[PDB]
Design a protein around this ligand. Structure first.
Ligand SMILES: Nc1ncnc2c1ncn2[C@@H]1O[C@H](COP(=O)(O)OP(=O)(O)CP(=O)(O)O)[C@@H](O)[C@H]1O
Ligand SMILES: Nc1ncnc2c1ncn2[C@@H]1O[C@H](COP(=O)(O)OP(=O)(O)CP(=O)(O)O)[C@@H](O)[C@H]1O
Ligand SMILES: Nc1ncnc2c1ncn2[C@@H]1O[C@H](COP(=O)(O)OP(=O)(O)CP(=O)(O)O)[C@@H](O)[C@H]1O
Ligand SMILES: Nc1ncnc2c1ncn2[C@@H]1O[C@H](COP(=O)(O)OP(=O)(O)CP(=O)(O)O)[C@@H](O)[C@H]1O
Ligand SMILES: [Mg+2]
Ligand SMILES: [Mg+2]
Ligand SMILES: [Mg+2]
Ligand SMILES: [Mg+2]
Lengths: 319, 319, 319, 319
DNA sequence: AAAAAAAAAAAA
């Protein structure tokens, strides 16, 4: 069945960032297929998409409705296997006969034409039969490359709700998850989580870790791991004529090159991972870090001598 | 039955772009099979084809006529299954015994010979028996590759009505759809929708989204998402000696290469999707974008150095 | 009964191209089974075969003769079903007891042996009993592959009339059909229809379309759709050293390769359908277009560089 | 009764090829059952078998004798139906009570055991009662596979007359039929018919066609249809080192492969039917053409490159 | 007692 009861509508901490998605889903559960017919939720990794879909399915089940939960990739696989075993009909009929269809991680429809076709047929029959549909994705339907324009058009033609985790929400979720666990809401602690968690998964994790080995524990390891990577303020921001806070946030040939440098150094000497440099610079997607390192590697006239100097300087006074 | 009552002839906002299709259908409903015997509607994705066919079927039902609605692909599938189970006769007889046949998305007859044969027989028996036929498609019968010349000849030999959504129509439909939400009378909403919706599905969607989270909300996210992709006016139209409005509309080795460039940059650094670059350049079909990017990739003497320069310049002052 | 009264002998516009078929049929109706015993009409798609057979049947009915109209494929199906239900005798007897037998689209007897057998028996009993027989086909009995030599021999042993739609006939039919709609006597209209209709179905269609949305309407869309595909005169006929009129009509390694090229380009960049390229080149059967494109694809030494050049040139100055 | 009076002994043009059959039949009519007791006529398709049997029956009727004409297949069917309805006795008695039994197309007794049994009994009772029997077939009793040895033995034990249509006969029949149609015996005409008709059915047909649309008409269409298929002399007989007249008649790895090739090409590019290639090569039974094409398809080392070359060459300079 | 014709086509 794949509907794990742990995920419920009541467990879903609501804030300024997911209120829309939550309420839309809930209300759709009230009247199934009546309104908000094709619901398309999308958000960054670890935003609560799966929790939401799961909970919806659980409610539907609780009310006696036919339900199917399934990932896009798993849909593809299953369909292919039914193709091999030649019971594709039973597959189709099974899918079309639901009262609620939950398809998580839709972005995995890229490149699979036949899957998109099968799901297209299913989507249509369900929609026309006034059955409820709820899809979830890590990106806006537009960002869906390699997805037939018909499917994208359908996705956009319904309700398009994003889940954005701003500070005001992450705070709510942190406090509430702390409360859920027999945790006490200290400010040093909350204030800490705020600064070092972007999504709900990191929050849950960190929190469990506190519940296991105390806050003071993490504080130190993290502090050192991070400050031994804070060679930018010590060296790059003094040598190059620039402010630190400036070299953290983006926005020019005077501080940008200082950043490219910083990243390069972090990667070359400190042996920090791409993810760590990314996290440290407040950068996202860990893409501009790799491309920036390649950038500093390409420009290599006498900038190379400078590089070498800064490198030796880093090895000597960084470890 | 697959005739969802939500779709009605009265719900069909009529304008300069779909008046013909609408009126032809309606009048055919008045006298079934008498005139406009084979009606063949076709249009771009999200034009109202399905709504129209649906409504027709609903009227026919309302007047006591036998009706069948079905997609081409679903017709194929069903037929095949009746083949496996050997009740193909019942299938045929069922289809031939209608007073109105609605076949949506006909373009899906390509490559299916046996289906085309079955539907050929059905089409003929119905036509001769003076029963009404209405097909819908995303392309002109000519554009139907892999469809037996007999079928295409039949399609063209009736009434061939296209649905084109010009501005004067999209305006009507926008205003009228707004009326439903008590949201008309808004200048900013209308002028906005005009600029950012091509078909009725995008209109419906956007509008629902306004009804949910206000106009001001969308305005910002969209504005930024789009203007951070507006690196053409800032960089490509200044470096290359060309006007912006010119680099938007097509029409030469002086501004075309500027566009190819623009698209390439958008895809490489901004990480924008094909659909987004397409939407941004006012291009359609998102084909000339991919082929144009491949074009700039193929010509790679010293144009490569130039490319690199423009790329670094983009990474630095675009994020 | 399947004899739709709309089709009549009087409705059959006669010209240099169908006079023979028409008069033979008519005269045979005068004396049934007396002379012109087995009539075998054949022609290109949309030539009036069905109209003629229909009208014949209607006359026979009008005079009190037993009549059966039926397509070959439908004959096969029916026969098979009578086989399943074991009432094959009633089927046979029913068919043998007519005064006139009309079998449309005979070419569909290919591969069906048992059907050919059943129809063989019927044909014989009828012929011997001096009853009238009229068959229609899209090809000369010789071209009938997979049809038992006995049947073909019988087909050829009667009257073999073809219906060819030359210009002098299409003109007559166009003028007369224009008279059918009370819309008439336009030189631009007639001269237009002549140039863009090959069979009577296209004529009827186009004309209905004029009666609906005026001539000026079609003129433009068609003109552009066609001239944006007229990249041959602009590029292929200038680059390659050849005349345009020459590259339209066939007839050598100096202009043939220019054509292969032209078609290839049309298909690759303009995204024109096979049917559209065919129509544009004045080619028929849309076969030499596909085979020609495959031809240019196979020869791919440095002809490939040339190809690429011509392609880029086309994308740039064709859209 | 199924004895159409159109067929008479007087209408039977006699020549070197059917004189024997004719005279045997006639004389047997003189003395019924006295001599030439079991007459077994056989010939190629369209030789006059049915005409002869018919005429015999008509004479018998004219003289007051009991007669039955019937095809073998129709005998089988009838017998089976009498089996279902349980009036098989009346059937038997009806058949045994004739003075003359005419069974056309005997070869259709293959695989029908019970029929062969019934007809065996009938044959015996009639023969013993000194009643006349005349069977007709498209093949020599030996060639009758799936016919009980008793029946074949009986067939061979009587008079076995073949009807062969040599030139000297076809000429007679052509001239006489031309005289029948109020035709003039022009030489180009006769000489034409000789070259393009093998059996009397083709003769009748062609002639009717002349009587309808003149000789000059056919001449052209046929000439072109045939000469556009005459790509053998132009290409296959020049490339391969061989004579044309040689490549027409059979009789070795030097000209045979040239023929296999020729046929293959005709089928692949010219899109000619099996019957047309057969007719063109002077081949008979259209069997060696299919088997020869399969032959050239099977041998496909570098013979394939050669094939391709010849194919391109054919497409280019053959259309 | 003899014995009909035969669909479309995954991702990597
Ligand atoms: N708003 C919320 N309220 C309560 N719990 C939440 C929550 N958002 C996230 N969580 C918790 O975080 C965990 C991860 O959330 P979820 O599985 O939904 O991520 P996700 O599926 O949306 C991103 P991905 O699927 O790409 O990993 C869940 O176990 C869930 O309990
Ligand atoms: N003229 C009109 N009046 C009212 N509503 C309309 C309309 N045209 C389109 N719509 C709305 O737009 C939605 C989509 O339109 P439609 O059903 O015609 O899609 P479609 O089938 O034409 C595009 P596709 O080819 O992808 O199926 C419908 O739900 C319908 O309500
Ligand atoms: N000589 C004629 N006079 C009047 N109308 C004609 C005509 N020839 C063709 N038509 C019209 O063209 C239409 C198509 O003709 P028809 O039904 O005979 O097609 P067809 O059966 O001959 C070709 P196919 O069956 O292969 O599609 C008919 O509706 C008929 O009215
Ligand atoms: N020797 C002859 N004299 C006059 N007419 C002849 C003839 N031979 C053939 N015909 C004519 O040719 C037509 C076909 O001949 P016939 O009916 O005998 O075919 P058939 O039965 O011998 C071959 P099958 O039965 O296999 O089709 C007949 O209508 C007949 O009039
Ligand atoms: Mg998920
Ligand atoms: Mg549709
Ligand atoms: Mg027809
Ligand atoms: Mg015979």
């Amino acid at each position: 069945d794949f509907l794990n009861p742990k995920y419920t509508l009541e467990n879903f901490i609501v804030g300024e960032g997911n209120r829309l998605a939550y309420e839309v889903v809930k209300e759709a559960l009230e009247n199934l297929g009546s309104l908000y017919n094709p619901i398309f939720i999308y958000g960054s990794v670890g935003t609560g998409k799966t929790h939401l879909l799961q909970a919806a399915g659980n409610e539907a089940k609780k009310r006696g409705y036919r339900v199917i939960y399934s990932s896009a990739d798993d849909f593809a696989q299953a369909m292919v296997e039914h193709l091999k075993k030649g019971t594709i009909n039973e597959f189709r009929n099974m899918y079309k006969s639901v009262d609620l269809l939950l398809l998580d991680d839709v972005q995995f429809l890229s490149g699979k034409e036949r899957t998109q076709i099968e799901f297209f047929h299913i989507f249509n029959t369900l929609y026309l039969l006034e059955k409820q549909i709820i899809l979830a994705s890590d990106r806006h339907p537009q960002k869906l490359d390699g997805v037939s324009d018909r499917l994208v058009s359908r996705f956009e033609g319904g309700i398009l709700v994003e889940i954005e985790l701003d500070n005001k929400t992450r705070f709510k979720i942190i406090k509430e998850k702390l409360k859920e666990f027999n945790l006490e809401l200290r400010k040093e602690v909350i204030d800490y989580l705020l600064e070092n968690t972007k999504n709900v998964r990191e929050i849950e994790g960190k929190i469990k870790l506190i519940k296991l080995k105390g806050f003071e524990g993490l504080e130190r390891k993290e502090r050192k791991e991070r400050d031994k990577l804070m060679q930018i303020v010590e060296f790059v921001a003094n040598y190059y004529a620039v402010k630190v806070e400036d070299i953290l946030s983006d926005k020019n040939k005077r501080t940008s090159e200082a950043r490219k440098i910083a990243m390069y150094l972090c990667r070359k000497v400190c042996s920090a991972s791409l993810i760590e440099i990314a996290r440290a610079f407040k950068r996202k997607d860990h893409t501009t870090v790799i491309h920036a390192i390649r950038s500093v590697e390409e420009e290599k006239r006498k900038f190379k001598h400078l590089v070498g100097f800064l490198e030796k300087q880093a090895f000597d006074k960084i470890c």
